[PDB]
Design a protein around this nucleic acid. Structure first.
Lengths: 125, 39, 793, 213, 820
RNA sequence: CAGCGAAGGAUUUGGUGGAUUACUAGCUAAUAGCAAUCUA
């Protein structure tokens, strides 16, 4: 019944599903808040989808992320990818396309690996 | 022509002195357009 | 910058309808699909009218003052155009399919065959203002029982002689008082009467029918009542008459049949002057010059147009176009001609000013997919679906090289080196890129690494790195030259069609199937910026499909994009009837062009009237390398959109004291540099030309050395677009020499600013000035031989 | 005068976010402490190789810099310092330990010299990287050296190498750890004191090049 | 005042003005000719399509118009015009100065009543011609016989008689003998209308108190009377399809239907037209048909139809009420704002003081449609406020349409009178939008704009604050606060990069838009009332309070022109689509055109109504003005789209006035100069043999030039004629015994290329000479005359290497500069 | 519940009319007739 949006963030074998919907503004990773995501030195790697665009985008929506697999740093990279492209997809579908591609421009100017992973490797020289 | 016109998306259309030779290239008034090596 | 207007329509010299000449038969007016092209055959140039019928046009006439045209389409929507001002005067809907329209010889009336009624209207003035209803009906006569096929006015605009599908022909006086002179009907034909003409003295009447009989009618006694005196027959057995015309002054009957054969007769004696063939398709139109020396024939199936002088048995032109089947285009390295690769298997090299094809090349046995120039207009490469890339010398017009693979695949795109050692081509069924040397013929390499069909290839013009992009959602950058064998894959969000490459080779812009144009830095493989284009795309609704144009996923993406030559803009087109251009710093739509309003094409209307067809699509877009234009290979032809500086007052930092009056006072007071920069701040073409011609030769280099650097591309592009057609050859070369000597270091360190203004200048030096210098050189050497040597016996 | 309103309600979230974390949406600082603006590279020819113009939040950009030639000239120089810190057999892979001791050494660089530690480490790079060197012109193995110049990427490479391995050997068996020895090394290399391993090694390389020039 | 740029074309959006229309019947179809001020308009009653508009505007207002089969008779100030297909066929001048104000047409007679109670009879000449044309007699209704003539009719089967309905009496004239046959008894109240019944010799009279009389014009009695209390009766019509109904039309806008057979009242259509504009002005049944066409003074023409009865046995007693059928309409009040909807000049948006937004078609008047005001649903799901009795929005101050994203989301942004929010509209759906943008400072909306990306709308409030909303999602994005008094103009670049605002404190602010900075601020010398941004040339014009128009560019922020000359407040102005002119209109009843290149006033029109709106088309086709009186939109066409106008100033180097420069023939006698002609003529001459393989006066002038030693006429003939003629003249040049014609041609070419003109043609003529018969020149080489002629040809021709090393320098240095 | 909220609100549906191409009028045996009728 609610406007909701589901995205995916992947690094090596971690995978994070982020559901974004309209709400009061709560960002929850694995049930716990976002301010508990260990190893606590990469908590700003998790935070930078919020601090790159401002918390006034997150003031009206609530995100929840479920992260399985991987290790510590692969899980924080999956979390930040899921949060970033979930915010982009929510502003695409339920807010205007101008804020959509402003968010895409800001995340892509920081690093496009917030939005597109580096996936299939190696190179056979 | 008929097998690749039905295997396609976009549309494909289909004695006197001379047939006027309507299709003809080489002409910006060229007569000896051969190579010097060719000659 | 962004203020492009529809200039020209290359390709497609004839589609459907009647050819017309001028009165002084210098230009011929040819109905291309819903435009009208006018080709001036003496002053070698051509233009297309900007206006646009909503269906294919079927009738053309302009009066013999040359002052206004009327064009009727295939359900009777007439359009009256001012022929000199090139602006449309009136839109008038006759209600049914009009077969012919003709102006009178005295210009003041026109008549038309709408259904089975001959209706004569009287011509509005060109000097009068536009009214709500400018046409005033003279009369409408109904005596035929089936549809009228032809009109013919008499020499004095006094009688009109009409021919019908009903097996008769009738003569009607224009005014009511001569009703008794013209009340007869002419029976006796077994088939449709295709033409009915007067003789020069209006005593004999010739009536030509579809089965092949021409009847001579004379006012004789067997009282005096229009007997038939002789029936002549063509005796063409399987074929039958498709178009008839008659020049009454030279007594020349020209007749085209449904077999391509046309015969021309000297009529009252019926002696075959000539008989020859256009081709195998029927001759849909014959038209004759006012002096009767030129005959223009049009066949509608292959889209071909002859004009042929029958005295000196020779074709003034042979020009066949391509409807709907044009896969690629490429500008020549000076923007003088466009090479067209077309689906019936051939290359065609079209001059741009004179709208005609110079050379054609048929060595591909299947649809040619890509053309690309190299070695600065000397060589041209093309790849087709028959498995071959092949190279074309545009000097000796020979296919000197043919490159095949080893796997029997069909090639869909190519890319050549700048230093044209290597050609490169990619297919849509092989996932590899084929790398051939051009000097030897061998297959130098097969680059592998895409996991999807290689949709597009382009070599960087400066650092020579290869960029390919494919439907596995990946653009890929190959360092081929010099021991690297380096591959850099950039992933992207969806599957790519039409990569394009900056003129400095720094960045690459890809078009994706999402609907976006992403722009990447090559050396540091990260995205610089994207345009979101799928909401400023006009995707029409087809007739056959059962889903709205809003929800369709057919054409909301661009299958061809191209950089401007200053690197700042992108023109783009696809399988939709909008072509859009953007400026890549700001990623905003500069302008969107509706490429067709023909309802005879399919994807034009977004909303269909609630009361297969050839779809509309652009297959290739390119910018002009010399003058501020772009060509788009649509289904209707090569649409050429160009700006011109005659209109659009767009100043550059003028103030209140900068005025045309102020400029001519500074010119009369002979501050020549101040007059030149005042005219540059006006940016008015006539003022720049006036000051430019008023500066004397004694102080060209002082002015050219003191020109400020912001007005340098303006004076260079002015000198280019002026000197192509201006006669002052030594004046223009003095100005070019002074500018290149005084400020030719600023140009070299700002290459891409003067990249289209310098290519337009050496389009003047090698194309008129060097031809003149060649002629005077040959005269000098023939003089020295003819007087220095021994002629004795 | 002129002022823009662009938020129209004080932004509050349901998950409470710390005040310094939500203060970090106006400027990106390294570890939310050290600002990247007014951090210039005070030696030209090394600007465009020491990169301080994209600010980061932690020295763990997982981007790929080792697949084109000069692509590691735009890895941020804090992260190049971190990556060069995590090398020997004992400490291979341990980038989080390297990031944590880089955080500790920037804290104690600032508490000793009360100035910007990113400016201190950038000055240390541009003072450490040698501006001349010798190759061994062979002649089959004739032991003679010829002085060459040295490109700026090699100067930044050898600067980070000299600093980090000087911090290792200075922490080898003394009371100080790698963070404190690296802090002393970066401070002394920034001011150019000739008490550091790194710029003593630079002075030796440049002096040998001056000798057999 | 007549103009020289714009010429009047039409006045669109007008359907009626409350002159009682006429119906006419061609065959079995019907047309409806309604007066719109000074023109009439013919409509096809089966579909209400505009067939014809009268060709010229009459010199005064049309006041009484009738229609027989093919012809329409329109009476204005003094005279009666007889029109066929719009084009006027005849003009009947009456011999009076009294205003003709009624007319009937029967037989060979046209009878026209003036307002001094005289009647003018006009007769056909021979009964086979088409309209009454010659004067016959004059009739007079004096004060003894009857009052003011209130109607003039001819009820059928009355051999050349005329029923004249005066205000109290009914007279019956014989119009051949000029006699008064019968004068009825008086009527106790003033009768206003009359209509002849389809019953034989019965007329129906409608009084100023509420009664319909059914007068029997042969018995002299009244048959029956129908009373409608307190209602002035303005129309009467009869049904003629086997159902005896009467339809009366009441000047409070009501249409009442009566059964005459069973004396009941069928139905009342209330408020069918506005009482304030006249009520129902003419209602008539199309005869034999159950459809009745009404028209009122509120610029509206409707049709109502009677469906067949719902009871299958009774029928005559169960009469289904009349329902609505097609109708045409326009604004009932003069329009207050005007915009063009698209670049094709097809639709134009138009808002009026009667609180309606219409979309009028410039191509086909059936496509004109009122934009609907039916609101959407609220986005959250709460209730919307407002009155239950729905009324129209307050009348529109401003609007801004930008159809870049059209059909996608909201497209028009509009600002209403004395309310603090700007509504949106969708032109594709032709309806209101979901968003009303607030000003957020309790000030009324003084200006609107929107960007050409279509994403952003801009609101400018009366407390000086620009708010920038998103048109797709309807929420506040940004809010600039520069001005302190009312912001009267906002616009933005075509690249969404710099915006420009102007307030009535007289400061133009220049802001960057992507960054939220200001680029500058420029203080003018008057409060600014209106801005128009020409977006391709980046030049915006301001209507200041000191009655000047300041043209200022946004790139370098300077006042670049200042146009003076208006005597009162500038109501409106607009740029040419090429941005060369600016047309303004002001309260001194004038419209001026300014050529801002030269900075002066090109043309001026004194127009009697003050033009409140001026808009160009986005192509250069049309000007649309909007005046104080008149419910429509006046449309002008610029004649400078077909000719070129002189930019020479009016009051109260002809090439530079017509913006041309015919390039002079050669700049200096020491300069080489090609021919004025096609460049290909040299190549055609040099290779016309292989070109074709792939496909006398001259001798007399040559001899005469050899006499006079001046070959100017010879060279003129050579430059004139065609390549086949040139080859055929050079190839036949008497190369046999004394060689005179060859050497005369050679020193003619010498005299030619001494003059430095046409020199590529003189070079090819020498090449054609050496090609044709250079073998005879080589044969009698060392002949004195031919050797000296070639000697002086080489003497002049050796100075042609100036062109050679000039193009060598240009080619070499151009190649070096471009590549390296 | 709070909030929104003018003599009510929401959802669904049948019919008709106007647009969905750019407005020169109906009929016929048509230089004119008819349209009340073509026929003696």
């Amino acid at each position: 019944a609610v406007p909701s949006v589901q995205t995916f963030g992947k690094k090596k074998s971690a995978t994070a599903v982020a559901h974004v919907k309209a709400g009061k503004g709560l960002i929850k990773v694995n049930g716990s808040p976002i301010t508990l995501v260990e190893p606590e030195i990469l908590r700003f790697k998790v935070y930078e989808p919020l601090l790159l665009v401002g918390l006034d985008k997150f003031s009206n929506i609530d995100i929840r992320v479920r992260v399985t697999g991987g290790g510590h740093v692969s899980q924080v990279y999956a979390i930040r990818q899921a949060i970033a492209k979930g915010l982009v997809a929510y502003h695409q579908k339920y807010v205007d396309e101008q804020s959509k591609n402003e968010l895409k421009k800001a995340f892509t100017s920081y690093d496009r690996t917030l939005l597109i992973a580096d996936s299939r490797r190696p190179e056979p020289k | 022509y008929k097998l690749d016109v039905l295997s396609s998306v976009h549309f494909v259309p289909k004695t006197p002195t001379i047939s006027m030779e309507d299709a003809q290239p080489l002409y910006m008034s060229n007569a000896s357009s051969l190579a010097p090596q060719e000659i | 910058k962004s203020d492009f207007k529809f200039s020209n329509l290359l390709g497609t010299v004839y589609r459907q309808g009647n050819i017309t000449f001028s009165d002084d038969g210098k230009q011929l007016l040819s109905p291309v699909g819903n435009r009208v092209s006018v080709f001036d055959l003496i002053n070698n140039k051509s233009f297309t009218f900007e206006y646009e019928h909503r269906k294919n046009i079927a009738a053309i006439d302009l009066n013999k003052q040359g002052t206004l045209l009327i064009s009727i389409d295939e359900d009777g929507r007439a359009i009256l155009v001012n022929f000199k001002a090139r602006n449309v005067l009136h839109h008038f809907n006759f209600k049914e399919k009009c077969s012919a329209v003709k102006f009178s010889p005295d210009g003041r009336l026109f008549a038309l065959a709408s259904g089975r009624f001959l209706q004569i209207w009287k011509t509005p003035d060109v000097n009068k203002d536009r009214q709500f209803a400018p046409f005033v009906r003279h009369r409408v006569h109904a005596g035929h029982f089936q549809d009228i096929t032809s009109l013919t006015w008499s020499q004095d605009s006094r009688f009109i002689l009409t021919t019908s599908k009903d097996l008769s022909a009738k003569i009607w006086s224009v005014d009511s008082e001569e009703k008794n002179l013209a009340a007869t009907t002419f029976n006796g034909h077994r088939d449709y009467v295709m033409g009915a003409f007067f003789s020069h003295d209006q005593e004999k009447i010739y009536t030509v029918s579809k089965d092949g009989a021409v009847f001579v009618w004379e006012f004789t006694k067997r009282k005096y009542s229009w007997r038939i005196t002789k029936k002549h027959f063509f005796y063409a057995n399987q074929a039958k008459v498709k178009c008839v015309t008659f020049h009454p002054a030279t007594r020349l009957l020209a007749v085209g049949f449904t077999s391509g054969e046309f015969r021309l007769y000297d009529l009252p004696d019926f002696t075959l002057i000539q008989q020859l063939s256009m081709g195998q398709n029927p001759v849909n139109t014959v038209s004759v010059n006012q002096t009767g020396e030129w005959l223009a024939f049009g066949s509608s199936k292959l889209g071909q147009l002859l004009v042929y002088e029958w005295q000196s048995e020779s074709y003034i032109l042979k020009q066949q176009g391509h409807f709907d089947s044009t896969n690629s285009l490429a500008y020549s390295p000076d923007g003088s001609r466009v090479v067209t690769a077309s689906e019936d298997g051939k290359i065609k090299v079209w001059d741009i000013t004179s709208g005609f094809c110079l050379a054609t090349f048929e060595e591909h046995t299947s649809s040619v997919t890509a053309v690309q120039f190299a070695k600065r207009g000397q060589v041209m490469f093309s790849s087709s679906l028959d498995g071959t890339v092949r190279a074309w010398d545009l000097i000796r017009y020979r296919n000197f090289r043919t490159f095949t693979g080893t796997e029997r695949i069909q090639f869909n795109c190519l890319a050549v080196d700048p230093s044209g050692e290597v050609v490169c081509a990619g297919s849509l069924d092989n996932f590899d890129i084929h790398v051939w040397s051009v000097q030897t013929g061998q297959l130098l390499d097969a680059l592998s690494g895409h996991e999807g069909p290689v949709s597009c290839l382009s070599f960087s013009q400066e650092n020579s790195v290869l960029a390919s992009a494919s439907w596995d959602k990946t653009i890929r950058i190959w360092s081929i030259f010099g021991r690297s064998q380096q591959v850099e894959p950039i992933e992207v969000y969806s599957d790519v069609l039409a990569l394009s490459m900056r003129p400095d080779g720094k960045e690459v812009a890809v078009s994706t199937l999402k609907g976006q144009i992403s722009i990447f830095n090559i050396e540091d493989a990260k995205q610089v910026g994207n345009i979101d284009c799928r909401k400023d795309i006009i995707s029409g609704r087809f007739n056959q499909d059962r889903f709205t144009a809003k929800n369709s996923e057919r054409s909301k993406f661009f299958t061809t994009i191209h950089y401007s030559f200053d690197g700042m803009a992108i023109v783009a087109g696809g399988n939709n009837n909008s072509i859009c251009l953007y400026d890549v710093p700001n990623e905003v739509l500069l302008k969107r062009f509706i490429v067709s309003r023909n309802m005879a094409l399919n994807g034009t209307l977004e909303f269909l009237n609630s009361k297969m067809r050839p779809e509309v699509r652009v297959t290739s877009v390119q910018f002009s390398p010399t003058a501020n234009a772009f060509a788009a290979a649509s289904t209707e032809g090569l649409l050429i959109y160009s700006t011109n500086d005659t209109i659009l007052f767009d100043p550059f930092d003028l103030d209140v004291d900068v005025t045309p009056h102020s400029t001519v006072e500074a010119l009369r007071e002979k501050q020549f540099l101040n007059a030149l920069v005042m005219a540059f701040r006006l940016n008015e073409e006539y003022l720049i030309n006036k000051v430019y011609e008023a500066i004397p030769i004694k102080e060209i280099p002082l002015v050219a050395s003191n020109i400020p650097a912001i007005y340098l591309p303006r004076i260079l592009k002015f000198i280019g677009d002026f000197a192509i057609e201006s006669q002052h050859i030594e004046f223009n070369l003095i100005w070019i020499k002074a500018l290149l000597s005084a400020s030719g270091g600023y140009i070299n360190e700002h290459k891409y600013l003067f990249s289209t203004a310098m290519r337009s200048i050496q389009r003047f030096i090698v194309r008129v000035a060097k031809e003149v210098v060649n002629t005077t050189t040959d005269n000098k050497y023939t003089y020295r031989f003819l007087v220095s040597t021994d002629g004795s016996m | 005068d002129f002022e823009v309103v662009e938020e129209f309600t004080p932004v509050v979230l349901a998950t409470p976010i710390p005040e310094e974390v939500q203060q970090a949406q106006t400027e990106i600082k390294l570890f939310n402490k050290w600002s990247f603006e007014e951090v210039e590279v005070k030696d030209a020819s090394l600007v465009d190789y020491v990169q301080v113009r994209q600010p980061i939040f932690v020295a763990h950009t997982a981007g790929r810099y080792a697949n084109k030639r000069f692509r590691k000239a735009q890895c941020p120089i804090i992260e190049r310092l971190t990556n060069s810190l995590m090398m020997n057999g004992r400490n291979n892979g341990k980038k989080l330990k390297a990031v944590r001791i880089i955080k500790h050494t920037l804290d104690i660089i600032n508490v000793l010299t009360d100035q910007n530690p990113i400016q201190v480490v950038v000055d240390a790079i541009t003072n450490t990287g040698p501006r001349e060197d010798t190759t061994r012109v062979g002649g089959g193995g004739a032991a003679r050296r010829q002085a060459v110049d040295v490109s700026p990427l090699r100067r930044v490479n050898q600067a980070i190498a000299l600093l980090t391995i000087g911090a290792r050997e200075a922490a080898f068996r003394n009371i100080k750890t790698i963070a404190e020895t690296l802090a002393e090394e970066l401070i002394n290399a920034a001011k150019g004191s000739s008490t550091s391993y790194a710029i003593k090694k630079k002075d030796e390389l440049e002096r040998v090049a001056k000798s057999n020039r | 005042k007549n103009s020289k740029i714009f010429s009047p074309f039409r006045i669109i959006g007008n359907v009626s003005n409350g002159v009682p229309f006429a119906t006419g019947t061609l065959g079995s179809t019907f047309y409806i000719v309604t007066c719109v001020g000074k023109t009439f308009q013919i409509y096809d009653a089966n579909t209400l399509h505009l067939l014809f508009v009268s060709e010229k505007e009459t010199p005064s207002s049309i006041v009484a118009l009738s229609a027989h089969f093919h012809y329409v008779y329109a009476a204005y100030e003094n005279k009666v015009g007889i029109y066929k297909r719009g084009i006027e066929e005849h003009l009947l001048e009456l011999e009076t100065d009294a205003n003709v104000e009624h007319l009937c047409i029967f037989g060979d007679y046209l009878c026209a009543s003036t307002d001094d109670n005289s009647i003018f009879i006009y007769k056909k000449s021979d009964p086979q011609d088409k309209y009454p044309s010659e004067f016959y007699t004059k009739l007079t209704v004096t004060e003894i016989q009857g009052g003011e003539i209130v109607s003039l009719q001819h009820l059928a089967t009355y051999l050349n008689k005329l029923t004249v309905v005066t205000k109290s009496n009914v007279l019956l004239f014989n119009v051949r003998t000029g006699k008064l046959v019968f004068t009825s008894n008086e009527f106790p109240d003033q009768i206003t209308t009359a209509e002849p019944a389809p019953v034989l010799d019965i007329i129906a009279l409608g009084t100023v108190t509420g009664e319909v009389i059914m007068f029997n014009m042969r018995k002299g009695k009244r048959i029956r009377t129908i009373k409608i209390p307190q209602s002035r009766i303005s129309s009467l019509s009869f049904r003629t399809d086997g159902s005896s109904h009467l339809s009366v039309g009441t000047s409070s806008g009501d249409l009442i239907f009566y059964d005459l057979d069973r004396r009941s009242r069928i139905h009342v259509l209330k408020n069918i037209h506005r009482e304030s504009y006249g009520g129902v002005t003419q209602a008539t049944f199309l005869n034999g048909q159950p459809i009745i066409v009404t028209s009122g003074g509120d610029n509206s023409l409707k049709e109502y139809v009677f469906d067949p009865s719902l009871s299958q046995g009774s029928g005559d007693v169960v009469v289904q009420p009349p329902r609505y059928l097609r109708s045409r309409g326009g604004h009932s009040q003069p329009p207050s704002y005007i915009a063009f909807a698209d670049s094709q000049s097809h639709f134009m948006l138009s808002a009026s003081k009667d609180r309606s937004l219409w979309s009028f078609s410039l191509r086909k008047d059936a496509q004109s449609q009122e934009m609907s005001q039916r609101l959407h649903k609220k986005q959250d799901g709460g209730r919307v406020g407002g009155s239950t009795i729905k009324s129209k929005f307050p009348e529109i101050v401003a609007l801004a349409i930008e159809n870049a994203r059209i059909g996608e989301w909201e497209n028009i942004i509009t600002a209403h009178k004395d309310e603090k929010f700007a509504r949106t509209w969708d032109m594709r759906n032709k309806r209101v939008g979901r968003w009303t943008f607030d000003t957020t400072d309790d000030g009324f909306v003084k200006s609107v704009a929107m960007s050409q990306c279509g994403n952003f709308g801009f609101i400018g409030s009366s407390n000086g604050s620009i708010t920038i909303y998103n048109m797709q999602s309807g929420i506040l994005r940004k809010k600039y606060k520069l001005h302190k008094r009312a912001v009267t103009g906002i616009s933005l670049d075509g690249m969404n990069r710099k915006m420009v605002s102007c307030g009535l404190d007289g400061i133009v602010g220049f802001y960057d838009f992507n960054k939220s900075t200001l680029l500058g601020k420029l203080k003018l010398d008057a409060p600014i009332t209106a801005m128009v941004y020409h977006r391709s040339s980046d030049l915006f014009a301001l209507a200041l309070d000191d009655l000047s128009i300041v043209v200022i560019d946004a790139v370098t922020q300077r006042v670049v022109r200042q146009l003076w000359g208006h005597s009162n407040r500038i109501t409106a102005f607009d740029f040419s689509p090429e941005g060369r002119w600016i047309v303004s209109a002001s309260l001194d009843s004038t419209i001026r055109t300014w050529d801002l290149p030269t900075g002066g006033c090109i043309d001026g029109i004194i127009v009697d109504n003050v033009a409140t709106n001026v808009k160009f088309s986005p192509n250069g086709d049309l000007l649309a003005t909007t005046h104080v009186t008149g419910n429509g939109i006046c449309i002008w066409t610029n004649r400078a789209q077909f000719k070129t106008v002189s930019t020479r100033t009016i009051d109260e180097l002809n090439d530079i006035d017509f913006n041309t420069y015919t390039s002079l023939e050669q700049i200096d006698k020491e300069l080489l100069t090609l021919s004025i002609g096609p460049r290909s003529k040299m190549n055609t001459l040099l290779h016309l043999d292989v070109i074709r393989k792939r496909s006398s006066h001259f001798t007399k002038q040559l001899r005469e030039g050899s006499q006079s030693k001046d070959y100017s006429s010879l060279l003129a003939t050579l430059i004139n004629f065609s390549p086949a003629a040139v080859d055929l003249e050079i190839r036949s040049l008497n190369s046999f015994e004394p060689f005179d014609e060859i050497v005369w041609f050679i020193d003619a070419l010498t005299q030619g290329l001494k003059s430095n003109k046409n020199f590529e043609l003189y070079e090819t003529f020498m090449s054609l000479l050496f090609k044709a018969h250079g073998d005879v020149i080589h044969a009698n080489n060392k002949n004195q005359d031919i050797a000296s002629a070639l000697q002086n040809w080489e003497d002049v021709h050796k100075k042609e290497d100036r062109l050679d090393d000039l193009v060598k320098f240009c080619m070499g240095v151009a190649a070096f500069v471009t590549t390296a």
